[PDB]
Amino acid sequence: YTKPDYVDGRGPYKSFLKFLPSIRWYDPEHYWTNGSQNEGVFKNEECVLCHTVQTPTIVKDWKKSAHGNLEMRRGLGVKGKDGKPVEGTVGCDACHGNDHQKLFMPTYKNCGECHPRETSEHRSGGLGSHTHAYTVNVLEFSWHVGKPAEEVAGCAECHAIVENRCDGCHTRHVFSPAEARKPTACRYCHMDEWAMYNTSVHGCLYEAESATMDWSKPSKKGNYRVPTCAYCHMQDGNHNPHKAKRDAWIKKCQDCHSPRFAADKLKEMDAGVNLSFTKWREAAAVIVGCFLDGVVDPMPEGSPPDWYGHYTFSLLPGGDPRFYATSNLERLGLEMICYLTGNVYKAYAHMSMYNQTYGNGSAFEQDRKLVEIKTEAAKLRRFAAIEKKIGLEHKSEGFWQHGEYLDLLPGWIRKPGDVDVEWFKRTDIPHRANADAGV
Amino acid sequence: YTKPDYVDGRGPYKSFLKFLPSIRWYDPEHYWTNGSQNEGVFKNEECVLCHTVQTPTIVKDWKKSAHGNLEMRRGLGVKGKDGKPVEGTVGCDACHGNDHQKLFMPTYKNCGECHPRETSEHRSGGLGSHTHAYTVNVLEFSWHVGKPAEEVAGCAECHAIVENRCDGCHTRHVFSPAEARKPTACRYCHMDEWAMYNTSVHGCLYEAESATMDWSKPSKKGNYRVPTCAYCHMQDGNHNPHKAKRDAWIKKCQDCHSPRFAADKLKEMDAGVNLSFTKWREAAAVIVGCFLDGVVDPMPEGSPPDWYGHYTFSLLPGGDPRFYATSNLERLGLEMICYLTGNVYKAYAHMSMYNQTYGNGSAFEQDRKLVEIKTEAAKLRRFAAIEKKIGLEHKSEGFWQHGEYLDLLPGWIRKPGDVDVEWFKRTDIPHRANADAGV
Amino acid sequence: YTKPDYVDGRGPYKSFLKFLPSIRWYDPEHYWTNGSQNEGVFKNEECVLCHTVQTPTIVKDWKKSAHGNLEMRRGLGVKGKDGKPVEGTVGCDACHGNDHQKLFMPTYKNCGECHPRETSEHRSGGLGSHTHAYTVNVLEFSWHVGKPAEEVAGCAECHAIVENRCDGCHTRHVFSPAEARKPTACRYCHMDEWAMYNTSVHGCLYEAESATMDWSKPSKKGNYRVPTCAYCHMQDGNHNPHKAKRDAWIKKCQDCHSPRFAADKLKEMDAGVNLSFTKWREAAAVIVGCFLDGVVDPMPEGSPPDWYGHYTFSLLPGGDPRFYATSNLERLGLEMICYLTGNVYKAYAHMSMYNQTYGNGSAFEQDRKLVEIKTEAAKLRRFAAIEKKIGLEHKSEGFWQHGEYLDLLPGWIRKPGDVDVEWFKRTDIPHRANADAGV
Ligand code: HEC
Ligand code: HEC
Ligand code: HEC
Ligand code: HEC
Ligand code: HEC
Ligand code: HEC
Ligand code: HEC
Ligand code: HEC
Ligand code: HEC
Ligand code: HEC
Ligand code: HEC
Ligand code: HEC
Ligand code: HEC
Ligand code: HEC
């Protein structure tokens, strides 16, 4: 194994966090440098008919877009950068630049010149939304910072497409709202939301009607028979995704349904999640219970240190819950709470009858995982008992602590004074709760 | 944890079986009560243009239906309730009623007034079909009655849509046969039938042609190139799904294929299932073999009592085969026979080449599960051996028997004389074979 | 259990290898015999209008094909068998024959009369391609020969459709290139390539546009916005799927993308696979490490003999890596290298962001499997330690070695001098590296 080329990180853990050079297409404001052979300052017309030979699809798309094709316009009345409206064609130079040796890759800031509302709404969201997916939910996230860059390359890419740039639900060089309204524009990131929507009758009607139904109309009351990702969350074309919030859902459901039917189905979600929590309470008592007696193989000391730089239990306040570089009991615990408990919430919400019970990450799988946890707990307790009686001092195996991949973990290189807590002190952005956060 | 609002059960175990209030939309004959704020007796025209503002999609659908749009009719010659035919529009009041304080939710009985044939054929099916999915395969089913209502909410809902009401394969307010013919109208319930159909070339041709092919024609000989769920099982529009039954399939396959090709492929199914049974015979001998020696942790007594109310082995006559609240050896056993052995049958039948071998619930996974069972058996036998020699009396752990979810199980509250066996004594409906059935 | 009817094998292990009679539709050159009731020599016109009643779909397809419908032709200038071009209709007798008692089932040889280029390109491929999928990757393959015929029926069928006959990507009786261009024509065999393509944005755009986009155009530069299976691998309609090979991909990607973007994404693939290998190096050291100490339950001698006929370790040169009829430690090892390590390569290549990390057969699952391997290793080492101290001689269990399915394995009947090494000596076809290969 040889270490690939790395560029320096950007988050609060930037002292040791690294990125692959490909990050330039994902954080253009921060990592973009010129790398074009071609030179010269060109007019838009020169850009198009030179790229028709070189990169034909972009041009073909651009001609299928409102930016490039004036006939394909609805007279929105867009006013870009200056007050004056845009009547001419929005070309390649408008988005990328005129000089080839000074090309810039566009973000939400570049789009914000022409489209203020869609950008303002995009920046209005808080923690967990599209607004803070890269800045917070990548740079401060445990599994991303706790792993080498090439492993979590897709993690940085996926979370950054929706935050930084605008071509998430919009193809790239067509920017069609009809394409954006489709569930396909959402599921390549949301994958276990897609499985719930697919196994529900809402998703089934999509596949049945998508070829026939009119996609040109905006996601508004009456306009659509089949609900999509964009219809439910991006209400009336809004670019931002407990009685006040519940009645808001019932009113949206009242587009096609009775409010009584809407209320009953959302009450099913409450009752379904409540019973799934009791399954977790059983598991948590078992796993933590094994830690009290110290029968867990291996113990946190016998394992490699976590990304914080401590030898702490994963499923315990302070420690980092993980699936990697930990004991099997801790792995099966994290598997239940993160994946399975979260997916049951998604199953009841998206009205998936199968995934509520029999499906992937379901209540029946929660029962299966509960057995897996209990059997693991039974195994460790039987071993310890036998060892105690015969008079054997068992020590955790060497392969738990050290390995070719395990040595590459950043947990070994964590030293006091490497955290930039001034990043955490920021008021403009929300923050993830971490042990070494400072604040 | 707090217990949600429950309404009383209906099956033979109605003494302890409960349901969520949402069951009213699924068993309207039995659980529907009025819950509308709005009052007054209205004409159909008043119903439509008041609901256009409130619930627009229903109205838009109703106008896209033959019931609401007379232009969209094929002159079937429907004769509803009375002998006289229906020439006028079938409105909202025809299905739901005139008074808002006295609204009724329609079943197969309400549809049976106008459509006698489709209802008669629907009621003609026996055990395991759509006919007895809720009455028998929910109220008498082990995993449904053996679990709290909010967990198995979707179980009651899914099985009841196809039995009680008619909007299973038919959207709801469009009732399009073209939509019903599509596999999407079937797979939201049938999910592992869908995976087999999808990974087969039959399902692949569906996705390739669905946008282009004519869906308006009935499922008859010649009419379709690509076979669907509705084409194979609902032959010639029949609303009801060994040489006599085999030749019946070959003749149906002869619509597109050679009978020799049809016979060879169905012979593959016979040979494929035969070899999958020998894998089960190996597993069964191992799991039951561990019960003879009493090495299973935990033993039925160490586990919580089953839904019947006994401390019996799961994979043994009398006992209830389950994945929950049992030992790992018993869980892996049930996983193989119910899911994997059943799915192999589905894989060979639906001509899925991948799912016959490499797929989910396949022959190769049966091999994987066989190892999982054998390793579990090896673990228990090695433990017992060591314990015996050193002189240790091992008792099953406490977390097996008792837990927050485990205490909520109905197995603890089973008392003699709670079974309504007069339900089981019925001649009009088939019955599931249970231990405490009485007959 | 009773053994189904078997026909003799054909590969180098033909002494014990068997096939189901259904192989006649898959190896027609080798296994096809007449089995038709109907007799007589007929003209093409007699074939069509007799099969319109009997097998209507074939006829309807044939009329929708260029072979049967002259109007549906692009004037290719096909010249069949003789030099003279084909102007008349290519009928049923042209493909199958005139006499019913002397019908032949077509291969690539039968198609090669009319279409020389598409056949020549089909035969140009080497090991691992469509060219040698049945002859080499079935008859010489370990899991196929090491299992009874009815279990690996689909294995023979799937691998033979693409090699022997031509109706793989082409329906059967339509032979539409538009249908062949679609990913659906590929994924029924390629299933974990499909999951990677589906979860990527390339596959998402397919489902979004397939109903609208023009499929009639050939897979060429500019012609398509959305890349498919056929677009990427079958470049410019070529019927054959490190700087020289890398730049070839970048140029193909340059159809829609910047070469810098193309280079960066393929560099991500290199770095992603490199880190996945270190996870394997950890696993391999652990599993083989357990074999040195002899703590593996069961040991190769305690297991049934492999398909070669030896009692060797699976994950060791000479031995056969398998998931069946082996220890759990060996199973989990094979699961990682074959499925998971191979799927990570597929995930990075097909630009799937989800399947790079969280998906099925991913880097995060590699971490999960690494724990599973380590826990299994920990279990075996703890057992052996306890046994040694107390003075117990542990022997592997009987159910590992013998069973109803295990007895049916060909490993028991392997005798010296059963291998046809003259098959392996062939120069016209590449060969799989086996222990008993001879050369
Ligand atoms: C900055 C990053 C963004 C800009 C600028 C725009 N978008 Fe979007 N977008 C999305 C959807 C689903 C729609 C269709 C809404 C509907 O149902 O009607 C749109 C639409 C637009 C429009 C058209 C609005 C109009 O009134 O004409 C514009 C001008 C537009 N978008 C610009 C989806 C998404 C999305 C989800 C993943 C993101 C991140 C963005 N859009 C971001 C931007
Ligand atoms: C009571 C519960 C039901 C009534 C009343 C009807 N159906 Fe269905 N249905 C289904 C399919 C797949 C079709 C299309 C059949 C074809 O291929 O041609 C239909 C069609 C009908 C029709 C039209 C028949 C005609 O000759 O015009 C009527 C009037 C009709 N259905 C009424 C599917 C299903 C289904 C599967 C899930 C169920 C449960 C029902 N239908 C139930 C009813
Ligand atoms: C022998 C086994 C084969 C013959 C003879 C032909 N094919 Fe194919 N084929 C495939 C695709 C994806 C296409 C479309 C290519 C495109 O994008 O334009 C085709 C096309 C043809 C054509 C038309 C070529 C023309 O210039 O008109 C012919 C005559 C043809 N094929 C004959 C895919 C495949 C495939 C993949 C699974 C296989 C095995 C074959 N084709 C095999 C044959
Ligand atoms: C013909 C001589 C061209 C003209 C005029 C313009 N572009 Fe170009 N561009 C051209 C080629 C052959 C390439 C690929 C090789 C390379 O230099 O990278 C490109 C590349 C781009 C890129 C990607 C550059 C990168 O950093 O990866 C962009 C963003 C781009 N081109 C845009 C662009 C614009 C906006 C132009 C008009 C002013 C323009 N190009 C002119 C060929 C030619
Ligand atoms: C990939 C680039 C995405 C696309 C396209 C869409 N979404 Fe997304 N979404 C994505 C990420 C990485 C995140 C952040 C996850 C986190 O919690 O850190 C989100 C967030 C959401 C949310 C908010 C979830 C919450 O805070 O509770 C919603 C409601 C949501 N996404 C829905 C959604 C819809 C409807 C989309 C289609 C238009 C969509 N997303 C696109 C990744 C991506
Ligand atoms: C793109 C295909 C993804 C990859 C790669 C990863 N993430 Fe993601 N993220 C994705 C979605 C759309 C969602 C679901 C959001 C929802 O509302 O449930 C998420 C979810 C996770 C969460 C976990 C939970 C929570 O605590 O909020 C976070 C914040 C997050 N994602 C982190 C993250 C990182 C950086 C990844 C690599 C280690 C990981 N994601 C993969 C899909 C995208
Ligand atoms: C306007 C005043 C209305 C007229 C006239 C009719 N309906 Fe209605 N309906 C209306 C509203 C605002 C609501 C939702 C609030 C509520 O009372 O539940 C409804 C609801 C229904 C329902 C669902 C009732 C339930 O139990 O959940 C049904 C089945 C229904 N409406 C049907 C219906 C019919 C058949 C009518 C004609 C006689 C009719 N409604 C008239 C508003 C109005
Ligand atoms: C959900 C509401 C369903 C829809 C829509 C369809 N089916 Fe179904 N089917 C469903 C259930 C709950 C059951 C009973 C399961 C049991 O065994 O208890 C069935 C049953 C069948 C059967 C009979 C199986 C047997 O007895 O061997 C068949 C053949 C079947 N279903 C096929 C089928 C088809 C082709 C459908 C589309 C028109 C369809 N079902 C719709 C649930 C649901
Ligand atoms: C709707 C999405 C479903 C949910 C929820 C559950 N069931 Fe179901 N059932 C479904 C289908 C369509 C099938 C397959 C039928 C086939 O022919 O194989 C079934 C299968 C099960 C069976 C198991 C086997 C047999 O013994 O017949 C039964 C009878 C049954 N279903 C019971 C049942 C209950 C009540 C559920 C919750 C505990 C369970 N189902 C979930 C899909 C639908
Ligand atoms: C009517 C009398 C027919 C004429 C004339 C032809 N075929 Fe036929 N064919 C017919 C039937 C009723 C059947 C099914 C019963 C059977 O004999 O198998 C067939 C079958 C075929 C088959 C499949 C045979 C097999 O081995 O499975 C083929 C390949 C076939 N038919 C082709 C064919 C051709 C090319 C003809 C023209 C010369 C022809 N058939 C004439 C009925 C009749
Ligand atoms: C089923 C009949 C298949 C269809 C249809 C397609 N492919 Fe395939 N492919 C199939 C097999 C059985 C194999 C051999 C697997 C082996 O390694 O033994 C292949 C091989 C390929 C390859 C070569 C892989 C390699 O050697 O590295 C490629 C690139 C490939 N297949 C792609 C591919 C595409 C793009 C297809 C659509 C046109 C396609 N295949 C069809 C099985 C089948
Ligand atoms: C059709 C649905 C399949 C079945 C059944 C099996 N095989 Fe296959 N094969 C399939 C594909 C398209 C691929 C992927 C090719 C790629 O490039 O990755 C394969 C892969 C395997 C390989 C494994 C790896 C390698 O060493 O090349 C081989 C050679 C192979 N296939 C063997 C084989 C046999 C005979 C099967 C039964 C035991 C098995 N395949 C199932 C899909 C098709
Ligand atoms: C109907 C309206 C829909 C549809 C068609 C989809 N979703 Fe959602 N979704 C919906 C609800 C009512 C909820 C629950 C919200 C609540 O009451 O708490 C959700 C939930 C989600 C979530 C989880 C976010 C959270 O924690 O609150 C996500 C990420 C999400 N939905 C995304 C999503 C996607 C991608 C969809 C398309 C496939 C989709 N949803 C469909 C309502 C509806
Ligand atoms: C874009 C171009 C695509 C698309 C749309 C698909 N694939 Fe591929 N594929 C592509 C690349 C660049 C690679 C890696 C090749 C390399 O550099 O080594 C692959 C890889 C495969 C493989 C593995 C073959 C190998 O070992 O090299 C297979 C079997 C394969 N692809 C098939 C495949 C199928 C069936 C697709 C449709 C769903 C598909 N690909 C999409 C490039 C691209």
JSON list of C-alpha atoms and ligand atoms in Angstrom, two decimals, chain A residues 183 186-187 190 193-194 197-198 202 227-233 245-246 249 252-253 266 269 345-346 349-351, ligand 13:
[
{"chain": "A", "resi": 183, "resn": "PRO", "atom": "CA", "xyz": [-37.87, 10.72, -7.46]},
{"chain": "A", "resi": 186, "resn": "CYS", "atom": "CA", "xyz": [-33.28, 12.39, -5.16]},
{"chain": "A", "resi": 187, "resn": "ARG", "atom": "CA", "xyz": [-32.64, 8.69, -4.57]},
{"chain": "A", "resi": 190, "resn": "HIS", "atom": "CA", "xyz": [-31.28, 9.15, -0.44]},
{"chain": "A", "resi": 193, "resn": "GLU", "atom": "CA", "xyz": [-35.54, 6.46, 2.01]},
{"chain": "A", "resi": 194, "resn": "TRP", "atom": "CA", "xyz": [-35.86, 5.12, -1.55]},
{"chain": "A", "resi": 197, "resn": "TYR", "atom": "CA", "xyz": [-40.95, 4.94, -1.13]},
{"chain": "A", "resi": 198, "resn": "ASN", "atom": "CA", "xyz": [-40.52, 2.15, -3.70]},
{"chain": "A", "resi": 202, "resn": "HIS", "atom": "CA", "xyz": [-47.03, 6.02, -3.86]},
{"chain": "A", "resi": 227, "resn": "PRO", "atom": "CA", "xyz": [-46.80, 12.29, -4.83]},
{"chain": "A", "resi": 228, "resn": "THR", "atom": "CA", "xyz": [-43.04, 12.48, -5.36]},
{"chain": "A", "resi": 229, "resn": "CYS", "atom": "CA", "xyz": [-40.02, 13.44, -3.23]},
{"chain": "A", "resi": 230, "resn": "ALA", "atom": "CA", "xyz": [-40.28, 17.01, -4.54]},
{"chain": "A", "resi": 231, "resn": "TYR", "atom": "CA", "xyz": [-44.05, 17.21, -3.99]},
{"chain": "A", "resi": 232, "resn": "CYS", "atom": "CA", "xyz": [-43.99, 16.30, -0.29]},
{"chain": "A", "resi": 233, "resn": "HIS", "atom": "CA", "xyz": [-40.86, 18.07, 0.96]},
{"chain": "A", "resi": 245, "resn": "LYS", "atom": "CA", "xyz": [-45.78, 20.71, 12.30]},
{"chain": "A", "resi": 246, "resn": "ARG", "atom": "CA", "xyz": [-48.20, 17.76, 12.32]},
{"chain": "A", "resi": 249, "resn": "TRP", "atom": "CA", "xyz": [-48.42, 17.53, 7.08]},
{"chain": "A", "resi": 252, "resn": "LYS", "atom": "CA", "xyz": [-50.45, 18.69, 2.61]},
{"chain": "A", "resi": 253, "resn": "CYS", "atom": "CA", "xyz": [-51.90, 15.16, 2.67]},
{"chain": "A", "resi": 266, "resn": "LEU", "atom": "CA", "xyz": [-49.34, 9.76, 11.11]},
{"chain": "A", "resi": 269, "resn": "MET", "atom": "CA", "xyz": [-45.97, 6.43, 12.77]},
{"chain": "A", "resi": 345, "resn": "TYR", "atom": "CA", "xyz": [-39.05, 5.83, 11.22]},
{"chain": "A", "resi": 346, "resn": "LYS", "atom": "CA", "xyz": [-38.63, 6.17, 7.44]},
{"chain": "A", "resi": 349, "resn": "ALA", "atom": "CA", "xyz": [-43.45, 7.92, 7.41]},
{"chain": "A", "resi": 350, "resn": "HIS", "atom": "CA", "xyz": [-43.39, 6.94, 3.72]},
{"chain": "A", "resi": 351, "resn": "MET", "atom": "CA", "xyz": [-46.33, 4.55, 4.23]},
{"chain": "D", "resi": 13, "resn": "HEC", "atom": "C1", "xyz": [-45.56, 12.21, 0.93]},
{"chain": "D", "resi": 13, "resn": "HEC", "atom": "C2", "xyz": [-46.04, 13.42, 1.15]},
{"chain": "D", "resi": 13, "resn": "HEC", "atom": "C3", "xyz": [-44.12, 11.89, 1.00]},
{"chain": "D", "resi": 13, "resn": "HEC", "atom": "C4", "xyz": [-43.36, 11.33, -0.03]},
{"chain": "D", "resi": 13, "resn": "HEC", "atom": "C5", "xyz": [-43.87, 10.96, -1.41]},
{"chain": "D", "resi": 13, "resn": "HEC", "atom": "C6", "xyz": [-42.05, 11.19, 0.44]},
{"chain": "D", "resi": 13, "resn": "HEC", "atom": "N1", "xyz": [-41.99, 11.63, 1.73]},
{"chain": "D", "resi": 13, "resn": "HEC", "atom": "FE1", "xyz": [-40.32, 11.89, 2.94]},
{"chain": "D", "resi": 13, "resn": "HEC", "atom": "N2", "xyz": [-41.38, 12.16, 4.45]},
{"chain": "D", "resi": 13, "resn": "HEC", "atom": "C7", "xyz": [-42.70, 12.44, 4.46]},
{"chain": "D", "resi": 13, "resn": "HEC", "atom": "C8", "xyz": [-43.15, 12.57, 5.85]},
{"chain": "D", "resi": 13, "resn": "HEC", "atom": "C9", "xyz": [-44.56, 12.87, 6.31]},
{"chain": "D", "resi": 13, "resn": "HEC", "atom": "C10", "xyz": [-42.07, 12.37, 6.63]},
{"chain": "D", "resi": 13, "resn": "HEC", "atom": "C11", "xyz": [-42.00, 12.40, 8.14]},
{"chain": "D", "resi": 13, "resn": "HEC", "atom": "C12", "xyz": [-41.77, 13.82, 8.65]},
{"chain": "D", "resi": 13, "resn": "HEC", "atom": "C13", "xyz": [-42.20, 13.91, 10.09]},
{"chain": "D", "resi": 13, "resn": "HEC", "atom": "O1", "xyz": [-43.42, 14.02, 10.37]},
{"chain": "D", "resi": 13, "resn": "HEC", "atom": "O2", "xyz": [-41.35, 13.87, 11.00]},
{"chain": "D", "resi": 13, "resn": "HEC", "atom": "C14", "xyz": [-40.95, 12.10, 5.71]},
{"chain": "D", "resi": 13, "resn": "HEC", "atom": "C15", "xyz": [-39.65, 11.85, 6.16]},
{"chain": "D", "resi": 13, "resn": "HEC", "atom": "C16", "xyz": [-38.57, 11.98, 5.31]},
{"chain": "D", "resi": 13, "resn": "HEC", "atom": "C17", "xyz": [-37.22, 12.09, 5.70]},
{"chain": "D", "resi": 13, "resn": "HEC", "atom": "C18", "xyz": [-36.71, 12.10, 7.12]},
{"chain": "D", "resi": 13, "resn": "HEC", "atom": "C19", "xyz": [-36.49, 13.54, 7.58]},
{"chain": "D", "resi": 13, "resn": "HEC", "atom": "C20", "xyz": [-36.82, 13.70, 9.04]},
{"chain": "D", "resi": 13, "resn": "HEC", "atom": "O3", "xyz": [-36.07, 13.23, 9.91]},
{"chain": "D", "resi": 13, "resn": "HEC", "atom": "O4", "xyz": [-37.86, 14.32, 9.38]},
{"chain": "D", "resi": 13, "resn": "HEC", "atom": "C21", "xyz": [-36.46, 12.19, 4.57]},
{"chain": "D", "resi": 13, "resn": "HEC", "atom": "C22", "xyz": [-34.96, 12.34, 4.48]},
{"chain": "D", "resi": 13, "resn": "HEC", "atom": "C23", "xyz": [-37.34, 12.15, 3.46]},
{"chain": "D", "resi": 13, "resn": "HEC", "atom": "N3", "xyz": [-38.62, 12.02, 3.94]},
{"chain": "D", "resi": 13, "resn": "HEC", "atom": "C24", "xyz": [-37.01, 12.22, 2.12]},
{"chain": "D", "resi": 13, "resn": "HEC", "atom": "C25", "xyz": [-37.86, 11.72, 1.12]},
{"chain": "D", "resi": 13, "resn": "HEC", "atom": "C26", "xyz": [-37.41, 11.35, -0.18]},
{"chain": "D", "resi": 13, "resn": "HEC", "atom": "C27", "xyz": [-36.00, 11.43, -0.71]},
{"chain": "D", "resi": 13, "resn": "HEC", "atom": "C28", "xyz": [-38.51, 10.92, -0.87]},
{"chain": "D", "resi": 13, "resn": "HEC", "atom": "C29", "xyz": [-38.56, 10.43, -2.26]},
{"chain": "D", "resi": 13, "resn": "HEC", "atom": "C30", "xyz": [-38.23, 9.17, -2.54]},
{"chain": "D", "resi": 13, "resn": "HEC", "atom": "C31", "xyz": [-39.65, 11.03, 0.06]},
{"chain": "D", "resi": 13, "resn": "HEC", "atom": "N4", "xyz": [-39.18, 11.51, 1.22]},
{"chain": "D", "resi": 13, "resn": "HEC", "atom": "C32", "xyz": [-40.96, 10.68, -0.26]},
{"chain": "D", "resi": 13, "resn": "HEC", "atom": "C33", "xyz": [-43.55, 12.58, 3.35]},
{"chain": "D", "resi": 13, "resn": "HEC", "atom": "C34", "xyz": [-43.23, 12.07, 2.11]}
]
